[PDB]
Design a binder for these strands. Structure first.
Lengths: 63, 63
DNA sequence: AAGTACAGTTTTTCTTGTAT
DNA sequence: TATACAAGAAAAACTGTACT
């Protein structure tokens, strides 16, 4: 699950939704939509993975 | 641009818009847009880099 | 013909405001 | 202070059809 994956990586970077949104260059509301199953493929997918030290690949299919 | 990059490697791989469309899970129409510069951030980005045998970063950033 | 682009409509993601 | 809801705008998707 992408939402579960984001939520877990950010909680563990010890970031907040708004703090993350900042690094990713988006809004808190986008982070939530993502974290809450309202978005499958955000436009900020690349930056987000970059801001989580992960791979777009691990986010989408966690592999 | 990403457009540039996509169009090149498409041709370099000898693929047409519709056969890349099928490798990536999209429609040629969605391909023509990205290529023709309509679309800024295609959702199939990741599927695309795999198909074009490159990376998301080079695709969006080149280098 | 076969490959590419155009158009209208619809789905999805964003944005901004707010409520728990 | 942190996260969730929600209505409308916008990006971008689809289907169909038309260039070349």
């Amino acid at each position: 699950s992408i939402s579960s994956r984001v939520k877990s990586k950010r909680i563990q970077l010890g970031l907040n939704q708004a703090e993350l949104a900042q690094k990713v260059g988006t809004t808190q509301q986008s982070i939530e939509q993502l974290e809450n199953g309202k978005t499958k493929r955000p436009r900020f997918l690349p930056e987000l993975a970059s801001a989580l030290g992960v791979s777009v690949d691990w986010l989408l299919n966690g592999t």
